[PDB]
Design a protein around this ligand. Structure first.
Ligand SMILES: [Zn+2]
Ligand SMILES: [Zn+2]
Ligand SMILES: [Zn+2]
Length: 71
């Protein structure tokens, strides 16, 4: 139905929101500290001296273990 298409799109967008905002390939699993923006995978997060959302300096990256994580 049309609703099938609508829900497919909703699901796709929710899944994409859980993917790294830089590489668009890997799940978000990293927090820039202290600002708290949690928008990257570990690989992209390691390479950024400044937060890509707010431009605050990254003191360190905290790995986050989220219930949504998949493999
Ligand atoms: Zn990434
Ligand atoms: Zn930030
Ligand atoms: Zn724990």
């Amino acid at each position: 139905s049309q609703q099938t298409r609508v829900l497919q799109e909703k699901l796709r967008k929710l899944k994409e929101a859980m993917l790294c905002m830089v590489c668009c390939e890997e799940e978000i699993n990293s927090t820039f500290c202290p600002c708290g923006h949690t928008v990257c995978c570990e690989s992209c997060a390691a390479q950024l001296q400044s937060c890509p959302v707010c431009r605050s300096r990254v003191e360190h990256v905290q790995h986050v273990y989220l219930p949504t994580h998949t493999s």
